[PDB]
Ligand SMILES: Cc1cc2nc3c(=O)[nH]c(=O)nc-3n(C[C@H](O)[C@H](O)[C@H](O)COP(=O)(O)OP(=O)(O)OC[C@H]3O[C@@H](n4cnc5c(N)ncnc54)[C@H](O)[C@@H]3O)c2cc1C
Ligand SMILES: Cc1cc2nc3c(=O)[nH]c(=O)nc-3n(C[C@H](O)[C@H](O)[C@H](O)COP(=O)(O)OP(=O)(O)OC[C@H]3O[C@@H](n4cnc5c(N)ncnc54)[C@H](O)[C@@H]3O)c2cc1C
Ligand SMILES: CCN(CC)CCC[C@H](C)Nc1ccnc2cc(Cl)ccc12
Ligand SMILES: CCN(CC)CCC[C@H](C)Nc1ccnc2cc(Cl)ccc12
Ligand SMILES: [Zn+2]
C-alpha cells in the first residue's frame with residue numbers, strides 16, 4: 001500500500017466533463033487512501049513553449065541554441081527553470097501518472113504537449129542510452145484518460161478516422177514507453193457532447209469503478225502490434 | 231505561376247538545421263517567383279494555450295467555457311483574437327502550407343501544436359459537413375518537413391520507433407486531411423545532429439531540389455493503408 005498518484009489535467013473549465021473525470025479520480029483514489037496530487041495546467045498558466053528561458057545557467061553553446069543539449073546539461077547542473085523541476089518532483093514521487101485531457105487534433109492539447117516537451121527532459125526521463133524498457137521512469141505506471149468529439153464507431157478501423165489506438169501511438173509509445181513507463185489501458189470516454197446525460201453519468205461512473213481496481217491491472221504490451229494489428 | 235506559400239516554422243535558433251531548411255525554402259520558392267510568407271512562431275512568441283482570451287467579445291456562454299463552441303461562434307461573429315485571425319488570413323491566402331519543425335515526442339513542438347489548436351477552428355478549417363476530402367481548406371496543399379533525432383533505421387516497421395508513417399497519422403490525417411488539405415509527401419530529414427557535414431548538405435540540397443518541382447507533385451493517398459499497411 002501507500003501509492004502515490006499524479007494527475008496531469010488539461011481543461012479550462014472546472015464544470016467540464018474532463019473536470020468531472022478528474023474530480024472522480026481524486027475522490028476515489030483519495031477514498032482508497034492513496035496520496036494524490038493534481039497539476040491543473042491551465043489554472044497554473046503552465047508555460048508550453050520550449051525556450052532558452054528554461055535554462056538559467058551558463059549555456060554549453062551560447063552562440064547556437066540547442067534545446068535538447070541545453071536542458072540536458074541544465075538538468076545535470078540544476079539550472080532548469082523551477083516550474084520544470086516542480087513537475088519533475090511530482091513525477092519522481094508518483095507511482096502512477098494519469099493524464100486527463102480532451103483530444104485535440106488526434107493528440108493532447110498544446111498546454112499538455114508543452115508539459116511533455118519541457119518536463120520529460122534528457123537526464124530526468126530518459127538517457128541516450130536509457131530509453132524504452134531502459135527509460136529512467138521505469139517502475140512507474142502511466143494512463144491516458146481521454147475524451148473525444150468523435151464517437152466510438154467513428155474511431156474504428158473501418159471508419160475514415162481510424163481505430164482509436166492509432167492516435168495513441170505517439171503518446172503511449174513515443175513518449176510514455178520511451179521514458180520507461182509501463183502503460184495501463186487507456187480510458188476513452190467517447191463523445192460526451194453527443195451523449196445523453198444518463199450516458200455521461202455512466203461514463204463517469206465507469207471510470208470511478210475502474211479506478212477501484214486500478215492497482216490490480218496489468219499494463220498493455222506497448223507495441224506496434226497492439227496499436228495497429230497485423 | 232502566381233502561387234502562394236506559407237511556411238509555419240517552429241525552431242528557436244536561426245542557425246539550426248531547421249532554420250536552414252526554412253531559409254532554403256524561402257530562397258528557392260522566392261527564386262521561382264512565388265509569394266512567400268513565414269510565421270516564425272518562437273520569434274512571434276506565439277501563444278500555444280487554448281483559453282477564453284482567444285475570444286474578444288462577450289462569450290456565447292459566460293458560465294461554462296467550451297473552447298470548440300466558443301471559437302466556432304467567434305469565427306462566425308468575427309470575434310477571435312487578432313493573433314489567430316492574422317494566421318487564418320495567411321492560411322486563407324496560401325496555396326501551399328509547409329510546416330518546418332523538429333520532431334518532439336513523435337509530434338510537433340507544443341508551440342506549433344498550439345498554432346494548430348487555435349488557428350484551425352471549426353467554421354474556418356472544417357465544419358459540418360466539410361471535412362477530410364471536403365474539408366474547408368480543400369484545394370490547398372500541405373507538407374510536413376520534419377527533422378528527427380532518431381535514424382531512418384530506428385524508424386522502420388520493426389525498428390524501435392516503428393515506421394515514421396505511424397507518427398505522421400495524427401498530423402497528416404487527423405489534422406491536415408481532416409481540414410481538407412491534400413497532403414504532399416513528407417520531407418523527413420533524419421538525424422542531422424549525427425550526420426556528417428556532407429550528409430547534412432545533401433539533405434538540405436535534397437529539400438531545395440525537391441522544391442524546384444513541388445508544384446508538379448501528386449499528393450499521397452492520406453489513408454490508413456498508406457500509414458499502416460505493407
Ligand atoms: C482545438 C480542438 C481540437 C479537437 N480535436 C479533436 C480530434 O482530433 N478528435 C475528436 O474526436 N475530437 C476533437 N475535439 C473535440 C473535443 O475532444 C471534445 O470537445 C472534448 O473531448 C469534450 O470534452 P469536454 O470535457 O470539453 O466536454 P464538455 O462539453 O465539458 O461535456 C459535455 C457535457 O457533459 C456535462 N457534464 C460535465 N460533468 C458531467 C457529469 N459528471 N455528469 C453528466 N454530465 C456532465 C457538461 O455539462 C456538458 O454539458 C477537438 C476540440 C478542440 C477544441
Ligand atoms: C523535447 C524534445 C523532444 C524530442 N522528441 C524526439 C522524438 O520523439 N523522436 C526523435 O527522433 N527525436 C526527438 N527529439 C530530437 C529532435 O527532433 C532533434 O534534436 C531535432 O530534429 C534536430 O534538428 P535541429 O534543427 O535542432 O538540429 P541542429 O542541432 O540545429 O542541427 C544539427 C547540425 O546541422 C548543422 N547545420 C545547420 N544548418 C546546416 C546547413 N545548411 N548545412 C549543414 N549543416 C547545417 C548545425 O550546425 C548542427 O551542427 C526531441 C528533441 C526535444 C528537444
Ligand atoms: C457545433 C457544436 N456543437 C453543437 C452540437 C457540437 C459540439 C462540437 C463537437 C463535439 N466537436 C467535435 C466533434 C468531433 N470531432 C471534432 C474534431 C475536432 Cl478537430 C474538433 C471538434 C470536434
Ligand atoms: C551534444 C550531443 N547532442 C547532439 C547535438 C545530443 C543529441 C542527442 C540525440 C540527437 N537526440 C535524440 C536521438 C534519438 N531520439 C531522441 C528522442 C528524444 Cl525524445 C530526444 C532526443 C533524441
Ligand atoms: Zn510502446
Ligand SMILES: [Zn+2]
Nearest residue numbers: 403407452453
Ligand atoms: Zn488522410
